[PDB]
Structures are given as structure tokens and as C-alpha cells.
Amino acid sequence: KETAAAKFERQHMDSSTSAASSSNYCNQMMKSRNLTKDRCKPVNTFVHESLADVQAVCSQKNVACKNGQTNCYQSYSTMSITDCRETGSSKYPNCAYKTTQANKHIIVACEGNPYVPVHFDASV
Ligand SMILES: O=c1ccn([C@@H]2O[C@H](CO)[C@@H](OP(=O)(O)O)[C@H]2F)c(=O)[nH]1
């Protein structure tokens, strides 16, 4: 099995690169992180910051989650991220994505003890 915390790291953490990306960043990352196995995951964001910095967001600005829950948090500082959006011509299993880089405040949902990220909600 895989914990929600571990899944968040697999799906949304990529500290190995500051700005990372290459036009093919997402095409390679969505596949390597196994996000295209059961289907082409439509949208997924990778954060280029230390695990500590991202985990710390759980003690930052409390904001409402898109699903109505109250356990979401927004980072006070902007973070380097890469949004991966499935193209319109993408056809499983050959999932194709558009690699977009940006510097925004991330919003994640946190749960557990330790209180850590378990869902990436949005960026603003
Ligand atoms: O800015 C955004 C918005 C959404 N998601 C993607 O949307 C899912 C469905 O809520 C998420 O998976 P998750 O709950 O497994 O994190 C997230 F991964 C991102 O990666 N970035």
C-alpha cells in the first residue's frame, strides 16, 4: 500500500530541479511518477522546493479547500512549480502533456500526525 503523504510526494514533489522542465518535462515526469498507468491523469503539479518547505505550508495560511473542507493551506511565499495539463490530442497510453512553469502560492490539504500534505488543491 501507499500512504496519502507518500502519494503526495510521488505526485507533487520534485526538488531535484529549481526551474526544472524542458518542453518534455511533463511527458517524462507524468510517466516516471506512474501518473499515466491507469489513465492519463488530467492535471498534476510538481513543486520545485525542499520537502521541508512544502511540508511547512501546513502551518501557514489556512484557507478553504475547493471541496468545502477547512484543512487547506496557502504558502506565504511563492514557490517554483510546474503544471502538467493533458493535451487535447493525448491518447492513452501515450499520454501527452504541456509543460508550464510558474512561481505561485500553492494550496495543499494537510492531514495526520505528523500533519503533512496529502492533496494539491490549487496555486494562486
Ligand atoms: O493546481 C492544481 C489543481 C489540481 N491538481 C491535481 O487535481 C487533483 C484532483 O483535485 C489532485 O490529486 P491529489 O488529491 O491526488 O493531489 C492534484 F493532484 C494539481 O496538481 N494542481
Curated annotation (Swiss-Prot):
Q: Which residues cross the membrane?
A: none
Enzyme nomenclature, EC number: 4.6.1.18
Q: Secreted: present as a keyword of the record?
A: yes
Name the coiled-coil region(s): none
Q: List the disulfide bonds.
A: 26-84, 40-95, 58-110, 65-72
Disulfide bond among the record's keywords? Answer: yes
Alphabetically, the GO molecular function entries are: lyase activity; nucleic acid binding; ribonuclease A activity; RNA nuclease activity
| Purpose | Endonuclease that catalyzes the cleavage of RNA on the 3' side of pyrimidine nucleotides. Acts on single-stranded and double-stranded RNA.
Q: Which family does it belong to?
A: Belongs to the pancreatic ribonuclease family.
Identification of the protein by name: Ribonuclease pancreatic
| Name of the encoding gene | RNASE1
Q: Which residues of the full protein are shown?
A: 27 to 150 of 150
